[PDB]
Amino acid sequence: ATLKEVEMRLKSIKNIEKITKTMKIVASTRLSKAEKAKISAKKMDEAEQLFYKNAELIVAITSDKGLCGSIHSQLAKAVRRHLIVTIGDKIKMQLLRTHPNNIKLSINGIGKDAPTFQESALIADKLLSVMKAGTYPKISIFYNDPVSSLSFEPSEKPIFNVPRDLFEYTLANQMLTAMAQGYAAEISARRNAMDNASKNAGDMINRYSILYNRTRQAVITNELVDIITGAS
Amino acid sequence: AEYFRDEEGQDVLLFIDNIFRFTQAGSEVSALLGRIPSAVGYQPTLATDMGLLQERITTTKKGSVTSVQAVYVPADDLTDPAPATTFAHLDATTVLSRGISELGIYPAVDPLDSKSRLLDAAVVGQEHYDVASKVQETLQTYKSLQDIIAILGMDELSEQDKLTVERARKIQRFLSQPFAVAEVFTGIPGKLVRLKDTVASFKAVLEGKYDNIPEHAFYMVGGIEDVVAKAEKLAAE
Amino acid sequence: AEYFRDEEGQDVLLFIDNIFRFTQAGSEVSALLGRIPSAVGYQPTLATDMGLLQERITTTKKGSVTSVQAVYVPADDLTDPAPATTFAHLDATTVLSRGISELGIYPAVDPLDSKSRLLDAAVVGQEHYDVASKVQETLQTYKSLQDIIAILGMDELSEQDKLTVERARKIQRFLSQPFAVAEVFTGIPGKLVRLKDTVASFKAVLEGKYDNIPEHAFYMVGGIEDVVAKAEKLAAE
Amino acid sequence: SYAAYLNVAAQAIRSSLKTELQTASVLNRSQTDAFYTQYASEPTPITK
Amino acid sequence: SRAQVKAPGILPRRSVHEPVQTGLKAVDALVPIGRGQRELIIGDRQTGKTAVALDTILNQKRWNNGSDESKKLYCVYVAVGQKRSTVAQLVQTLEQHDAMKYSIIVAATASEAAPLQYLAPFTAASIGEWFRDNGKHALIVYDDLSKQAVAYRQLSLLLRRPPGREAYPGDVFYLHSRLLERAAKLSEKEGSGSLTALPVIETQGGDVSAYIPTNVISITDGQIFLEAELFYKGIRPAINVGLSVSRVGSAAQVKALKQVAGSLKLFLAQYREVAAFAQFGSDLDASTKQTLVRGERLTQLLKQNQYSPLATEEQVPLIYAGVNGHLDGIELSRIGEFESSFLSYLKSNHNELLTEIREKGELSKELLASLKSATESFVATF
Amino acid sequence: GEWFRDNGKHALIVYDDLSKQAVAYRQLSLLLRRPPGREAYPGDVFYLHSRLLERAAKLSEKEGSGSLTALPVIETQGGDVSAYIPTNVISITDGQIFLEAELFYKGIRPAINVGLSVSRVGSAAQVK
Amino acid sequence: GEWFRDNGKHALIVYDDLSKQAVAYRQLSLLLRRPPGREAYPGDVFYLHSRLLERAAKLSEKEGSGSLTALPVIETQGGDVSAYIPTNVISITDGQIFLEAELFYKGIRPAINVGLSVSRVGSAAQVKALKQVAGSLKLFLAQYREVAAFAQFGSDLDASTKQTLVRGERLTQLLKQNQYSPLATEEQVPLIYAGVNGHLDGIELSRIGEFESSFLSYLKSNHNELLTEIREKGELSKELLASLKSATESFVATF
Ligand SMILES: Nc1ncnc2c1ncn2[C@@H]1O[C@H](COP(=O)(O)OP(=O)(O)OP(=O)(O)O)[C@@H](O)[C@H]1O
């Protein structure tokens, strides 16, 4: 109502806009690495996939950090539509609210940087040790794919002494291949999300910039009405 | 009205539209009467010139007067001396606001700024009181999250809060109601909704029975049965 | 105060509590005398009245009348003419903030909003200015990271900023002091510290010499030579 | 275990690289920070 | 007695050291009011102010029926600018609760000439000053001083005196000041009496920068700030614990309630700090999540119904169970079921704890440990 | 217009625009030392407009069936309808046609905001 | 000062500060009961400050070519320039030097906001030696003022921005200096040169003060001819820039 209130509101909004601009920029910088990673990993994946092409549980991957738009929403929804091991806290919570008894294993802290075969292999090892995953009649990997520079789509991918070592290795291969594509997708959706956020902040600033000027004119007029009536 | 109250002893209802004009007419004349003007430009006698009229509009041991007063708010400024002084003289106050009208939600009552002395469990019942408290809580939770929704979006919100926002958008829209005198310029025929039906409906909405019906089913309908009827009609489209 | 200066030949100090009401009363007396009110309602003579009061508070060859003035800031608005005019004359500030007692350190003086004109190398010396500047840098670095410490935790911080926050907490606590008058209610014995024993004591903390010691050893200790002893006595318990 | 076998064999092929060649990437490949917790009951967090 | 008698001076007073027990958790435990104090109940329209003053009036029933004249507190209510029907309803409430026998109502209603609205507070003060000067205790509630200011403005402007800020006269501060600090706590030399003032103020648009609020906030020893965003959230009474403050503080507080209000205030300060991140509770750090949990549970704990004041024997166990973490396992919606079902338990199976908290006034260790035991023996079944 | 009205004929009156009549009345008043109210306008601006616009009336066959139709125009600073004079004329009048600049620049001309626009007599006049 | 202006001499006038003059005039007029205006100020406060300030002038040869230079001071509450008297003076003057508290309590001294400060006249008056070397300092600082928000993130930043972040830090640490130590142009141009040409990048940001104080002594002790020429000529020849590059690099290497 008063000037000290509109100005503080405007300052808070400008702070939100700056905080979102820096986030957009850092998400733009962190992308090149993720895209290099996605391309290299998919180039590896093509080789191992070619064999199945010629011949013949769920892991759900998201990061723990939010403010990435619909990355976790669409994937939790796709997993429920298909209906579990959760990589990341946010898919963990989405699944835990709906079906708390189904979660068997959770991994967190991975997404802070581009994935690597160390994390994937160690996850595969704890998986085959605690769950003995290789015994399950079926295994499926749920992850997000960056179909474009401004959108993504969720996706499910199967996992079907050469056979033992081959499956045990392709498990780590596909977990890495999914983690990479999910990391790229979340960075892109954290660059478009903060773009929309900053533009909405701009629209809010353009509204409060009218509210402020109105309050300014009103304050001056009324202070001067008081002074004049005192001086009459 | 006072003769009907006292001399005839009958029950009386007094409609005054608009009582702000009394204070405004006093303001217009105050400057020519030779008085130093008070605040934003009203007369000194506002609070007492108002009281001398307002305190006559009251129920007495001799008779009852039920008073409905329209109070204009200039420049939408509820803080203007006249409304600010009138608020103290009324047992019930419904504040119509412009925002709720731009949203299309007639009769445009601000569900929160509107207040009544009788909204206590000793009078309306505990069910009714708790329903009204849950409605207010849902709507205020919705209004506290508006900045987040504007900038960030609804994705960030928690699971309870997404539900509370969907339910707030349903509730605020269900408080809309078409009036039989407004049909000429709104087209929608009128609806009268009983108190018990209203409480039961908002209870059923708060208790989650109708999370499966879209927001549009609640707009400008009457009771919950009409929400279901319109949901079926929209589905058939 | 001026008599004890000019006719007792000694340095005295004058407490005025509260200086806001000097200007408030000046505004009352001006309005009553029929002088046109200025800005938000103060007397036109505001600056000159404050001057004719303050400019007697000064050093002369016979002595100095020092003043410690409580300043009531209405509505927390440092831009109100009363505090705005007072600030032009005073050159040291001491902000006692609730935001520091809420976390339980007394005197409760804000190390960052509180400031002084005399914090200049030509007055306090470079050894003191360096220490003060690095204190106001560590505390401000901590006050920058609080959002990060909350949403994230202290593990995400770099090993540099983790050390900065540790030393900032130690400094925040070491600025606390038991008064020689609090001996009755708090029970704590109370002590006073010289400027050397303080500047050097903080230099030793910034230089990381006592980074081995926990934060609690700094809480109510007048000087590091007693922080060592408190650490020993706590570890022995 | 075969994937972890490849992981330890990779570490063997990796630490044996000249100390000038171990670019930041090579160190990064060796600093997995992940934690795991089996599950609504679950024990304390365990490092990988 | 004259209306504008002079207030007592420095020398005859004694410091505030005894409590004006409101029976409201949010006040007695966070912004205590003492006998001899001046506490401004400030807030926007329809926010809960009269409810606070009236619960304070109604809670004195447990002492005023007593024979010990040192504990009973008589009441005076000054209705300035109110309509007569509101006073009719207030007298109905006080009659129902049997509080009239210790209450005087002074009514300069809206239709009353402006001079009488200006003058009523001074005469009500002079009525209370009799109890003060005869060794008795009084609580004077002004509802409300903004309307006395409006009446004084009317009088002044029609007398052709020059206006100041916001069209008010120059000397409104001198109007309210020589009203409020007639409240005092007198020393044994002058009869040990007390007069306690609870002035109400109505803030338009929440603006405390207005002239009369800016004045009265400067005259009073503390403020209970009532805010509507808290009201609609079910925090009732809607006391903003962060804006509200007492300058008398611990001295005015019951000792047992002090021993826990310290920690209560610290934890609610931590909550006020983190609260900006309240909604996104999941992704925060452990300590921030814990602080959010405990602070939200305590804020819910402080709510209580209208015309249902509590004894301090009933406040201490509840603030203890909240501070000391027991309530962290209880869902935020069940806290209302808790404070109801716990006290009923304590009264039934652990009466001596309440009896000793009341009689002795201080939580002894032998008793604090048994209270811990008796709270564990409940949260387990709950 | 009231001549056509009072002699059985139909008239329409466009005022372009009342904001400037209000400004002129503010001038005339303040120069007469008439104390300023809200937005520095005199207290009797509502009476300036109400006795102007109430003359627009549809008469009975007892008088002769005339009518005077008033289309007052108002300029809004910054697009705000919450101002004093706009709100006053909205209170006097039987409807409003709000023309929004965002739509005008978009190429929606006439820029009728069908939401804020309303004719409280509505369908009664509309052609069947 | 007008005596000096009119007698062919050069005068500088520092008004500290004109806000209090406006307050004095408000008091003076309100006690005289003259009708007030905005902010309780009289109508013609603009005609007070203009009538004061624009007596400053540079005169033609017909009048002795004297001058009078005005540095008015205005105390802005909360840094708001929307106020009445600050607006008026900002409109009267040929520029502004904006000092910001946000930079002051972060240890920058003088706390000149390069983004808001502007001289609409002096760029023609500036010393050529300084112009040649500092032309790009505006751009480097304007880029640093953007990147400053992204700085705290770390390695994530591109090299084309890391270079900016490296330069602007040294530049801001260069432009700060202790009070009552005003430096000669001959000592200023070499430092801005070392900075704009990135020679300081190999020095820890904490030691720039040690660098400057040392550098001055070297040029003064081993390259005085160049300082002498800089101030005798005021402009850098093709050859002086080369000798300055040589001295700067030979120092930075052995610093
Ligand atoms: N603790 C509470 N719990 C539930 N309802 C409450 C509580 N306190 C107040 N209310 C409700 O708030 C409403 C306002 O009460 P109150 O008379 O205290 O307001 P007020 O501050 O006097 O406002 P005004 O005097 O301007 O009407 C009442 O209808 C009452 O039922």
Ligand SMILES: [Mg+2]
């Ligand atoms: Mg009330």
